[PDB]
Amino acid sequence: AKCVSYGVSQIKAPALHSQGYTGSNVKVAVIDSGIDSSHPDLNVAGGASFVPSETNPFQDNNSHGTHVAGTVLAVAPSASLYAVKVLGADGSGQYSWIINGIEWAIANNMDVINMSLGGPSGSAALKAAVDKAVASGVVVVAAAGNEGTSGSSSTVGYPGKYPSVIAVGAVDSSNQRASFSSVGPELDVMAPGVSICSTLPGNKYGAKSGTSMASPHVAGAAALILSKHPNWTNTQVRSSLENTTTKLGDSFYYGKGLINVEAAAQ
């Protein structure tokens, strides 16, 4: 048994794959619950755990990080993946552990950071870490959140909500916003996040829904762009992904729209 996200095709990733652009030599840090390196489909280049109770980043006791990693790889097959364990088995983590995982990514010369995580409040320490990663040349991508709507108020969670961080919302197979997808002015792009079939611990596969599922489609898109245009800065990658979107509806709901990697890559 095996599956691939339908989101691979929807973002126009196969068009770059056929041209020989598969994310080669790009360093992607998945800052999540760890990654089950033992999966036949997953290749992990390295990593680190900052969860005092779970020392092994190569062990995923939750399943979240393994599912997210598999999405990164389905989009950009040649990318060097790094397991940055900041959340435990329950899917929770301390802000300081998240910070230490961002700092690890900066020191270790990561190209792309994926953060399929969020909370309702931010910290000064958290915005300095994400802004330092952007100052250092890093492409920082995060899930917008699964908060739905609250009238006219933004429901985007942190670190997604910070301007330096690419906030990714969720669409289904028909380009429609998922009911759970967070809204607001801080929402940047849309990616497929409804019933994403990816890898799970102990040679398994299954479907998950969330903004957490949308995010890695964008981090894998960033890796594809960098494999074709090695000289391009994080700002240039961001601009290209944002400026080449398939426009869907109001910006409050959909941001700039759906990412189009074939367009973005020029």
Query: How far is 105 from 234, CA to CA, in rounded Å?
Result: 14
What Å resolution does this PDB entry report? Answer: 1.9
- CATH code matching the domain that covers 1-266, chosen among 3.40.50.300, 3.40.50.200, 1.20.59.10, 3.40.1190.10: 3.40.50.200
Query: How far is 120 from 128, CA to CA, in rounded Å?
Result: 17
Name the method of structure determination: X-ray
Can 60 be counted among the known catalytic residues?
A: no
Query: How far is 134 from 49, CA to CA, in rounded Å?
Result: 22
CA-based max dimension of the chain: 46
Rama region for 173: left / alpha / beta (φ>0; ψ in -120 to 50; rest): alpha
* In the block, residue with structure tokens 């360093």: 27
Question: Would you state the structure tokens that stand for residue 78, as one six-digit string?
Answer: 């040649």
Q: What is the DSSP string of the chain?
A: -----THHHHTTTHHHHHHT-S-TT-EEEEEES---TTSTT----EEEE-BTTB--TT--SSSHHHHHHHHHHHH-TT-EEEEEE-S-TTS---HHHHHHHHHHHHHTT-SEEEE---BS---HHHHHHHHHHHHTT-EEEEE--S---BTTB--PPBTTTSTTSEEEEEE-TTSPBPTT---STT--EEEE-SSEEEEETTTEEEEE-SHHHHHHHHHHHHHHHHHH-TT--HHHHHHHHHHT-B--S-HHHHTT-B--HHHHT-
Burial 220-237, CB ≥16 within 10 A → b, else e: bbbbbbbbbbeeeebeeb
Can 212 be counted among the known catalytic residues?
A: yes
Can 36 be counted among the known catalytic residues?
A: no
Half-sphere CA count of 188, side-chain side, radius 13 A: 28
Angle value at C-alpha 95, between 89 and 96, nearest 5 degrees: 100
Query: How far is 248 from 230, CA to CA, in rounded Å?
Result: 30
Enumerate the domain spans of the chain. 1-266
Query: How far is 215 from 167, CA to CA, in rounded Å?
Result: 8
Query: How far is 183 from 181, CA to CA, in rounded Å?
Result: 7
Q: Which entry of 64, 181, 198, 240 is annotated as an active-site residue?
A: 64
Q: Which entry of 49, 182, 212, 240 is annotated as an active-site residue?
A: 212
